[PDB]
Design a protein around this nucleic acid. Sequence first.
RNA 1: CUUGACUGCGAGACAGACACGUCGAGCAGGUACGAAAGUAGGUCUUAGUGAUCCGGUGGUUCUGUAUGGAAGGGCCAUCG
RNA 2: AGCCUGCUUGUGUAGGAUAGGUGGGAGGCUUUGAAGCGUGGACGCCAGUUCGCGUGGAGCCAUCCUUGAAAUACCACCCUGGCAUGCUUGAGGUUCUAACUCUGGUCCGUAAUCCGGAUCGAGGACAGUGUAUGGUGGGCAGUUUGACUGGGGCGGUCUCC
RNA 3: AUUAAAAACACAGCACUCUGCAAACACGAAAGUGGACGUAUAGGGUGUGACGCCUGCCCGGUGCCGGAAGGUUAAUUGAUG
RNA 4: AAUGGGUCAGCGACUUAUAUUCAGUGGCAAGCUUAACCGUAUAGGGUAGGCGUAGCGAAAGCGAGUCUUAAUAGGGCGUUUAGUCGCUGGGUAUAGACCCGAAACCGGGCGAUCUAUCCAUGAGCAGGUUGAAGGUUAGGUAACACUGACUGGAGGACCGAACCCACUCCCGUUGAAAAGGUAGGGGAUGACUUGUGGAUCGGAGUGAAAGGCUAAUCAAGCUCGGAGAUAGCUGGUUCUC
RNA 5: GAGUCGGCAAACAGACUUUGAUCCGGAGAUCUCUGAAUGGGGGAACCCACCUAGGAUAACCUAGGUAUCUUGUACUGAAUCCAUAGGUGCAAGAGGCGAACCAGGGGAACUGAAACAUCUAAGUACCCUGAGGAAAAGAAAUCAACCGAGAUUCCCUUAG
Lengths: 77, 78
Amino acid sequence: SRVCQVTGKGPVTGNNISHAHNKTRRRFLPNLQHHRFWVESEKRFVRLRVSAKGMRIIDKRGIEAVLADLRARGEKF
Amino acid sequence: EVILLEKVANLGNLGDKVNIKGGYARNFLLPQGKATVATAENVAAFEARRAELEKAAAEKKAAAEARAAQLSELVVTL
RNA sequence: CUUGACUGCGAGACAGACACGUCGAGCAGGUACGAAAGUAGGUCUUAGUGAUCCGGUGGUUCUGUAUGGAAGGGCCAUCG
RNA sequence: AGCCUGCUUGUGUAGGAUAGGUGGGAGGCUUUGAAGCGUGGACGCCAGUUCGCGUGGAGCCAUCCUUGAAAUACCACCCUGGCAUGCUUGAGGUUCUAACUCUGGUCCGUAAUCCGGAUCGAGGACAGUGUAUGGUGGGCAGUUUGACUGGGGCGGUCUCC
RNA sequence: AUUAAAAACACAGCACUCUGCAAACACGAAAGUGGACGUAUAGGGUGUGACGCCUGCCCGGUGCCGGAAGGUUAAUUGAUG
RNA sequence: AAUGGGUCAGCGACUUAUAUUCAGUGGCAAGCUUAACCGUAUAGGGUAGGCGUAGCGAAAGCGAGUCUUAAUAGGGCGUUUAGUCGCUGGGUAUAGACCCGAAACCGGGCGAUCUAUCCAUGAGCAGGUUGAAGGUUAGGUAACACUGACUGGAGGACCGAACCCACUCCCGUUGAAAAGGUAGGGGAUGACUUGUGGAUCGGAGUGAAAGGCUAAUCAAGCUCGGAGAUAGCUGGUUCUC
RNA sequence: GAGUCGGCAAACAGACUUUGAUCCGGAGAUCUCUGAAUGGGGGAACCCACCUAGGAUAACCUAGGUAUCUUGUACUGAAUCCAUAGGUGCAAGAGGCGAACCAGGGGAACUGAAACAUCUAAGUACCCUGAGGAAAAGAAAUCAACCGAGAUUCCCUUAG
């Protein structure tokens, strides 16, 4: 489903207030894309569907640290 | 934000910290072994290996001395 | 000649379901005219209009979320 | 479009010759300020000015010498016509490959037209998706569409004198 | 279906218009699937309705298609007061 | 000659909670009263809180006064003898709020055994006509055009049974039948009819299109919930003086 | 401690019990097929299997196993060299049902406003996912005004 595999960001819900203040149920989707991340210590790519906030977290913490606790949680890659 | 490891870039240096775009660090330099993100965890390991930068980077331009002599022969029969 | 087309009110009535509305002697403060009694709170009279809630503007003694201020609110005057 | 360097170029009335000025500054004498005419390089609100003076180690602009609203030589500070470039940024075009995409080939998981992985190819920072935003939008939706009235519809009338 | 069998709908034929393929288009929050294991002589939509003779005028409105690039104009910028 | 009731016997409509106001009736009285809770528990405790003993002002504030005001003037409101807590009635508020009664809206399922389309796999169409294209043959032309004879056996062809349909009349209308029967009628080798299995479903299907059909239901199925929707409407509301 | 062989269902047979039945409680034994249903299918209560061990004379029978997933581990190993995916075997655990209570995800409309859009109804009803006997929350980056109080939950007030 549309959850980031790094952050767990799924879709959330809210409203669509008009100028006459009609509220309508919409939904807020994460900016999740597919990205291949190079791991040196495995000599391959892993391809995980992450948000852009997850991309920034990979940039800050390293792919090895995030890929360590993806599998403690028990994700695919 | 990255330490370079090659001197033949068009806006690169030997080992100077340059701050670049995120895609250029992310998608090209780091998966090809030519840069590494400048982290504050192993910086005292870099200064005890500075004499490793001379040998391969001198040998690389020294191997192209006799490498370009076989490419311009024009002996390829199409 | 000139600003009484004043300010604070207001005894008492008229009208009237209510919200509204109508008239007003007198008192205080300041003024017009008039030599002076006095007249003057618009126009001979009755139409010429629009509630509240929102906003805007000028004051203010009031408030002002720990305190000193502000913000916002309140009252008074006013506009859409 | 932002910033800097030597800051060189300032040609009106009148001033031989120059006005954007501020202070040490009254004489410039470091080959004077190499000089009378002048070779070539530039430009001129045009015959105003810089350097190889044609040769050479040489007194010309006379620092009120006039004149002009402030005078030139000395020496520091900036900007203006702006010379050049990088330290940058913002919009286009082209190109590259490395993100990304492929409802392309070939291997492999595998006895699989799925799906992954590897590789080749092709496109390519476009496409596409997230979020924000203008536009369109009866495709769909929730509603509204007044009263009086010799029945209703039409016309007329709604407040005030 | 159970008061209307028709002049109604359909139809071959016709014309307009869309669509270069991961097609236009449809159903699907999506994946996918139909179109189609088809490929412009194909496929969707629309109107007309065999055949014969024909199918006139108007581009103002509205739509659709193309065109400069001038005004307007949104988020976002954040000068200045 | 408006409605309603065949009749009888049962049932069937002003409730309850919590806040409050007024009356009546009690207890205490410048005071009254407790709520949770504690309690060997309808006691006793617990006075937090509520109302009253003071009002005026929008407020700061000031107070038997206060506000307005330039005003010790006017004017507004207030000021010597009672309130509070029960209990029982009459009202009111919020609750389905005296009872019954819509059409409808929304949410979750259930249905394509009827039907509309489609998919797969099977099978039905007695009998009689008509005689297309092709061929063969004789003619006939440079081969071609073109004529006869024989053959052939086409077709959303024709007449007609089964089958499928449903145009007309009459009957039937409390039917034999919630859509039929009897006489006649249309198609009947196809854009046919049909069995069996499967697919599509409720702002959603399918539709040679009629708002047709989707289980005798259709301009938005059925069922269960929101739900005792809502009804300024209709009907009803029970002993006595 | 004297009757009994359950009930509608009273009788009747053949019987059982003082050497102690029936009856009552505790622990076992058996426990067919279905159903999460789990060997594979399936139209629930049916159909067809495989492997191991033992017994059975051209027919079988007994007792065990044989689902998927997750986690852990062992062995094995593709493209591809190394090792990764993948695959086989073991161990442990799960799944389903239940009126409510609880924490979350998604979430109406009638209704009221005497119409109706903001608003209400209402984060209600409904659907979904987890957990427990309760859950949730909880030990101050909390409130108070210069005084102080100290986690959370629940109740009465402040107060309509």
